[PDB]
Structures are given as structure tokens and as C-alpha cells.
Design a protein around this ligand. Sequence first.
Ligand SMILES: Nc1ncnc2c1ncn2[C@@H]1O[C@H](COP(=O)(O)OP(=O)(O)OP(=O)(O)O)[C@@H](O)[C@H]1O
Ligand SMILES: Nc1ncnc2c1ncn2[C@@H]1O[C@H](COP(=O)(O)OP(=O)(O)O)[C@@H](O)[C@H]1O
Ligand SMILES: Nc1ncnc2c1ncn2[C@@H]1O[C@H](COP(=O)(O)OP(=O)(O)O)[C@@H](O)[C@H]1O
Ligand SMILES: [Mg+2]
Ligand SMILES: [Mg+2]
Lengths: 389, 152, 51, 371
Amino acid sequence: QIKQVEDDIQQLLKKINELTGIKESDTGLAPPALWDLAADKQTLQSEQPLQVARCTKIINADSEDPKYIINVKQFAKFVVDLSDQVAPTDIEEGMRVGVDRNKYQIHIPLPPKIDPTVTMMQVEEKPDVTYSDVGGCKEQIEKLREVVETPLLHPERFVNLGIEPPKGVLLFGPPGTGKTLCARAVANRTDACFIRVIGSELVQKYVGEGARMVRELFEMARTKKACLIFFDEIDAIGGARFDDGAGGDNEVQRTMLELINQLDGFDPRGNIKVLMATNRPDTLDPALMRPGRLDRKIEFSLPDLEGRTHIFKIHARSMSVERDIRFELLARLCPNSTGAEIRSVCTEAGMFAIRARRKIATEKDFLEAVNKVIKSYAKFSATPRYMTY
Amino acid sequence: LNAKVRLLREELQLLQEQGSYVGEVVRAMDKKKVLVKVHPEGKFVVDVDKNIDINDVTPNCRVALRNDSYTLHKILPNKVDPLVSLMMVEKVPDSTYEMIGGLDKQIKEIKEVIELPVKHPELFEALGIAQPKGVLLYGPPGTGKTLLARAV
Amino acid sequence: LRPGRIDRKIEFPPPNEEARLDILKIHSRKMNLTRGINLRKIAELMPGASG
Amino acid sequence: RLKLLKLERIKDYLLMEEEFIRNQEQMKPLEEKQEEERSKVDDLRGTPMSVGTLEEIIDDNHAIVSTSVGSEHYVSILSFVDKDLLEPGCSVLLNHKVHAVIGVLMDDTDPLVTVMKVEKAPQETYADIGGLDNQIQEIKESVELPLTHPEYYEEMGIKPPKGVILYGPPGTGKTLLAKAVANQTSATFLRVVGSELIQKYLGDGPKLVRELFRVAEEHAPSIVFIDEIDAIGTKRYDSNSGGEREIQRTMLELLNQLDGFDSRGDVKVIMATNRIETLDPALIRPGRIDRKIEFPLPDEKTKKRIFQIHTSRMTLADDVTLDDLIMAKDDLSGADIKAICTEAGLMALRERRMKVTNEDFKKSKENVLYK
Ligand SMILES: Nc1ncnc2c1ncn2[C@@H]1O[C@H](COP(=O)(O)OP(=O)(O)OP(=O)(O)O)[C@@H](O)[C@H]1O
Ligand SMILES: Nc1ncnc2c1ncn2[C@@H]1O[C@H](COP(=O)(O)OP(=O)(O)O)[C@@H](O)[C@H]1O
Ligand SMILES: Nc1ncnc2c1ncn2[C@@H]1O[C@H](COP(=O)(O)OP(=O)(O)O)[C@@H](O)[C@H]1O
Ligand SMILES: [Mg+2]
Ligand SMILES: [Mg+2]
């Protein structure tokens, strides 16, 4: 009777759909559970649409009946007045006025414009990485934790001593040392607005578009009460300014200068704390590296023996390794290696076991993995160059 | 005669009707709706009229939309093919083997490698070799490369 | 130039004397040529020329 | 049986559900009937519905919508819309008269998505490859095995390698293994090239990289095959406005996409090249790409296998010896072998025979393998 049961189950599903709502996703429609037609009719008959304009000037701002010069974007500019439901103080000379049609007056104050590209940068889903997934950089974790979390968690211990906590960090180190890993850990552990930015995301085709979105990013952060920004791969736009003779890097230098002025200029930067992740901290501009903008430069040097042993432990926690581990032997056997190298060694040990069709990875498998990842791949390593860099 | 005159008198009345927009269909939805880009600004979704099988509104075709409450009510003659427009802009002069002269072995080679794979894709299958798909023509400027390509 | 992509490479060298004569005949078909023109002589007079 | 009783415990609650759903549907007062609600939806959504961008979401029942003409209407969003799939930059359906958000769009994909996706299985298969046993094993362990038997990896406690580099001289089977993986895999195959990543305006390269990997995530499980990644490097083009440094920023965007802040979904990266020394070591690092596998020129046995594979369909003449080709002791590649076979067939059809001969093979030698 099994097939009869499945046939009945699917027929029942088909009937439930046919009588409740089946398929409406072509025109992005919703399931009919949350369909408040009674409310939406009153919405369309009682809430008139409002065209978004900008209040340019307030003629006769005194208590006398004022007049506001609005500029309905790309439509027209008008002299208008406020709705009797809107208080005069709720509207300034730069807010998005939000005026109705038909004697453009039914006002709703409206926040600053944010580019969709910039606003699609807040970290909504927090990374699944924690501070316990980072090993061999205890002091770096402590310093980064201080700077980014501790003021945002217990500000009393800072205002008691009257200290301004450092607001700005530069995580710098060779390719694969825990820079982006620690950024993800900070994003996961932080209760605040985390905004990730990628140096390549500030390269835009039209002059003044990189600086424009830097300004928008920082002013959105300012609108939010407690914000951590994280410029990863900051090498992209952050580079020492050189005159040249053909105007090279003028646009990227302009957006970098906008970032500089936003970090520390003729303005209180706000409650924004910034991270700069890089593996070439020798191109960054001296102004960018000034401790008024990057206060707490942190070096993610290649882990020492203890750090490598800890990283091996971390990456082999969930593996099916055998009794005797000798991860200390592995750490001494693969010096001047990165956490990326170590995780690859663990993965290759697991794959050697899988290829042999075993369910237990042994010390011989780990030694083969070290030979494959550290010795054979030694010619593709980035450390010999990026340690100089 | 009476039908003619009545047609004129109703013509005066029905010429005051709003003219219909023209829009290019980009994609046909379900439930008898079509995504149409109306010239020169605007991209709407319009319900098809109950006189046109929605199966005939394949993308990239001009269609008339009624003035008020846009409603696809006619499939106008298709717009010029984008490829036709591109080739009209490029304006590669038309060529033929009789216009070509002096390169007969080259005509033979290009004939093999272009004609045979598309006309007789069985000789190559019987031989057991993949059909050729790349030709490169050496030669100084104006020696007949574009001429022979166009002719073949 | 890797020997796996260009399935054929044809060569269009500068026209020979006979090729130049053929090109001249083809391109002069479309004009009033007075009876008895030595297109072969013209082709010989113009060596090392393209179509 | 236990499973039969499970499915019965499902079907009985389902029948309960239809009983309740009917009951309610009839006691509705000749209104709110699913069809009636759908008709009311059509009534309230207007006959034309303009497509406009969603600039930002202010809250449920409100949003700023940019009309095609540039106006920025602040308007309500009705219960009709899912209040989901709505992110700044999305298309939105707006009631003509009141511009109310009454639907969403982008049900279609972009031409970039269409071109990148390989909506086909290449005819080449692992059986059509001869000599790359270890390379096939490793690429399978990286791309196919984690998809077909995730149990191995999950039980072992390791994650599969994220990327693989196929590095080898000009023609050794790198794109051939890419083709075989595309043929056999159940994931969506997205093919790109390095010169194809090198864009013209400033910021187009990074934008294309981001779009490619976003498409890969959207169509996950996916395999992103970047052939000739060294083209982003070695080659220099005038169309590139930014030049070497814009190339560097595109490479940096690739770095971030391969291993950056954002958590990847199911997107395995294959990347092929014949000049691996020109690649940025940060790009090749183990976290981004492990499994750097070489494709050396075939030895004598492998060359024999290539000739058998590529002559399996040709009617070789009895006198033809597929041994002199191999005895030619040069840097012979599989591409060279295939081209020799193909041009031998071309001379066969030229000289009108359906059977390839030793002379045809020798003149093919002299023609394509110019040595
Ligand atoms: N100290 C570490 N502890 C644990 N895992 C580490 C460590 N360093 C690197 N890893 C592993 O390597 C990856 C983290 O590298 P990450 O992305 O942070 O590199 P990065 O320093 O930002 O380098 P890049 O210059 O390439 O951007 C993860 O796989 C993580 O498991
Ligand atoms: N072999 C030929 N026979 C006849 N005309 C030729 C030949 N080669 C070139 N021409 C003439 O030269 C002109 C330009 O040739 P073109 O097709 O541009 O050659 P290419 O592609 O090598 O530049 C054409 O108008 C064509 O009529
Ligand atoms: N076992 C093999 N080794 C090398 N090449 C092969 C093999 N089998 C077939 N080929 C041929 O090699 C070509 C693919 O070469 P490819 O891997 O693209 O080289 P590259 O990527 O370095 O340019 C195909 O045309 C294919 O027919
Ligand atoms: Mg990183
Ligand atoms: Mg290739």
C-alpha cells in the first residue's frame, strides 16, 4: 500500500494548494496567508504616495509662516509649506523632505540617501567563526578584542579613567595568518553594526564615485550608534600618493584621501571603529598609517612552534585522528608555515586516509600530508615574498 | 456607397481615440501577462488582450499597447533584427566566388573547412575526426581575406 | 599558434601575374573597356600589387 | 511497517488539513475564496504595473521606489508582496496610479549569467582521457567526490579542498579535465577566462568577478572554472583603462572572492594555466587554492593511449603504424596528437579516401607538428 499512500499524500498536497494558493512567485507575490486585503484597500485609499524631494532653503525661517524650497529630484523645484501634522523642527535644510503631489506639502521627513551598493555592506548574517577558532596569535586577539569589543561592551571602565580608547586597527601580515579570520571572529562576536568593505569595491568607473561612496559609508555609520567598519584588502585603494607624470592613481588616491578625511579631519569621526586588513602594509599611505587613523597596528606574523601546535589542534579537533598525534612533531616539522598551510596539511591527511579507504587518519598520513603541502608545494608559497612585503 | 459614407462618418469619431503606444516584448509571464519595454522610457507588465494567443508574443517583438491601461492588443511587424542592424552598420561588401579571382586553391581549402562541416557533417563522422571550427587567413592587406570569407 | 585551435591556416600571398590578370579582368568587367585592351600588359606593368 | 505507519501518520494529518481548509472556505461569506482573493489582488494591482528600482526599505508597509524616469517616490508596500527577496537595487512592480509596491521581479537572469552557465554536458568524459590517472583522481577528490559521497568527508571530519589549479605546458589536458568534470558533475558549471575577466572601464573587472561568484552562489552547488588565469597577468591590453594596477585590483577581488569575509556556499573553484609562475602567490595560497596539480607532457605509453583514443573512430589503413608518431621523440602533446589525427583525416577526405594511410599521417606530421 506504500505507493497508494504516496499517491494520496501528493494528491492531498495538490488539493491543499489548489484551495489555499499554489504558485505566484513569477511576479514576486507572497503566499496568501499574510494577505490583509481589508487593510490594503484602506492603505491605498488613505495613504497617498509621496514623492521624495530635498528641502533646499527655508525662506523666512522665523516664527512667521515660513516657506521651504523643495527640489523634487529630476522633476522640478517648488516653494511649499508644511503639513499641519508635521512640526517645523522635524525638518532641516538638508533632510529628504518627502512631499506629496497636489500642492506639494504633506511632509514626511526622510533619511539621507544611501547608495544601494553601500547599504548592501552591513553584515546581516554573522560569520560562523569564533575567537576560539583562531590559534597562535593570543596577543593579537587580545589587542583587537580590546579595541573593537571592550569599549562597545563596558564603556564605564573607560569613562571612569577618562580614556579615549584607540579607534582604528590595521591587521597586517602574509597571505594567510588569521587577518580575515579575526575579522570574521570580530563580526561574529560583536553586538553592533558591522560593515564589511572590500578595497576592490571602492573602485568605480566615474571620477568622484569612490569618494562619494566612502562619504556615504561613513555617514551611514554615523547615523548608526555603534559601528565597526572593516576594510579588507585595503591595499586596493590605500597606496602612497605618487606624482608620476600622467596622473596615475589620481582617482584611487582621491577616494583614499576622502577616507583619510573621514577617519580624522575637521569633524568628530563619531563612534566608528575601523579595521584595515592587509598583506602588503608597505604601500599604504603614511597619512593612512598615522595613529590618528590606524591606532593599533597589529602584526599577524607566522605562528611560532606553540602557535602551530595550537593551530594543528584546532584544525584536527573534529577529525578522526588516531591515538598518538604528535602535533608538536608536525609543528616543528613545518616551520615558517601559515594557518592555511596547516589546515591544508590536516585536510590532505584526511584525504590520504579517504583515498586509502580508511576511517582513521594516522601519523603516517599526516607526515605524507606535510610532505605534500609544505615540501612539494613549497614553490607556490607566498610567505617568501610577503614576509619582505 | 452607404457603407463608404458611414465608414467616413465613424472615422471622424474614432480618430479622436488615444493613439496606442508601441513597446518591445522582453519576456512573457504566466496568467496572460507580458513584460514590455515601452518606448522610450518605462518597463511595464501588461495583460494581453483576449484576441492574441500569448504564445505568439515571443520576446523581442513590437506590440501595440492601448493608451490607458496598457493592454497588448496587436503584434506589430517585428523590429529589425539586432544582427541585421549590426551587419548593416559594419557594411561588409557582399562577395562571391565569381567576384574572387586568382586564389583557387585557397577557395578550395576554405570550401573544405567551412562548406563541408555544415553541409556534409557525415564525411567527417565517417572519417572519425572532429569537424574543423577555426580558420586563419595569412596575407598582406587587401589580398582577398575578407573577400573570400564573405564569399564562402 | 598552439597546434590544437586553428583547424586550418590558409595563405593569401600577393597575386601572381596570372592572379593579377584575373583580378584586373574581374574588376574591369564593370566599365566601358574599349575593344582590345591588354589587361595582361597592365598586370605585368603592376607587379607586387594587391587586389 | 514503520515507514508505512510514518507515511500514514502524514496522510491522516493531511486529510485533517483539507477537512479544516474546506470547512473554513465554505463558511466564508461568499468572499475570501482563494479565487475571489486572487481576483481582488488583480483588481488592486492595476492592469499595468511599472517596473522600478527599490532604492531602500524604510520599514514594513513603506519603501522608496525609483521610477524608470528617476523620480523617487516614497510609497507603501502592500500585503501582496512577500516583504522578502527585496534588497536595494531589486526590481519592483508598482501600481500605475499610486506607485504602490505590489510585486517583485528579476525572474529572468542576465546575459552574463546565460553566457557563464554551461547549459550542456561536454561530450568528453574521463574515459576519453588517457594517461592523467593521478590528476583525474585528485580533481575527482576535489570536485566530484565531495558531491557524490559527502559521507566520506563528513565522517572523516575534514572539509574538501576549495580550489584546484591545473598547471601545465601548452596542451596537456587541463581544459580536457575541466570538460570531463563538467560532463560528469551534477553541479552548475560556470566557465570564465582571464582575458575575459580583464575588463575595459575602471571597476568593471572587480564588478565582473563579484557578479560571477554571486551567480555561482545563486546556482550552488556550482563549479567555477577559470581557464588561463594567467591571462589576467601576462597579457597587456590597451582597452584596459586602468592598466596594470586595475589588473592588480581585479586580482585582489578574486582573492577576496576565493577566500574573504563573506562565507562561501557550495562553489568549488577549478583554475587552469600554463604559466603558473606569473600568478600572485597570495592567489594560490592553500586557503584559496590547494591542490596545485601538474600536467606534464605524456610519456611514451601515454602518447600511445592518446593515439588510440583519437584514432578509435578513424579507419586506419592496415599499413598504418601508430608507433612512428610516438617514436618521434619531441615535446609531443595530446593537442599535437589530436591535431595530427584530425589533419590526417582532412587529407584523407581531400584525396577522396575514407581510409587514412601512412603517407597521410606523415604529411600531417610535417604540416601541423612542424618538426
Ligand atoms: N592563526 C590561525 N588559526 C586558525 N586558522 C587559521 C589561522 N590562520 C589561518 N587559518 C586558516 O586559514 C584561513 C584563514 O585565512 P585568512 O582568510 O584569515 O587569511 P588572511 O591573513 O586574511 O590572508 P590573505 O592575505 O590571503 O587575505 C581559514 O581556513 C583558517 O582556518
Ligand atoms: N583575389 C582577389 N580577387 C578579386 N578581388 C580582390 C582579391 N583580393 C582583393 N580584392 C579586392 O580588394 C578589395 C579589398 O580586399 P579585402 O577583402 O579588404 O582583402 P583583405 O581582407 O585581405 O584586406 C576588395 O574590394 C576586393 O574586390
Ligand atoms: N590525455 C590527453 N592529454 C592531453 N591532451 C588531450 C588528451 N586527450 C585529448 N586531448 C586534447 O587536448 C586538447 C585540450 O588541451 P588543453 O587541456 O585545453 O590544453 P591547454 O589548456 O594547456 O591549452 C583537446 O583538444 C583534446 O582533444
Ligand atoms: Mg583576507
Ligand atoms: Mg586550455
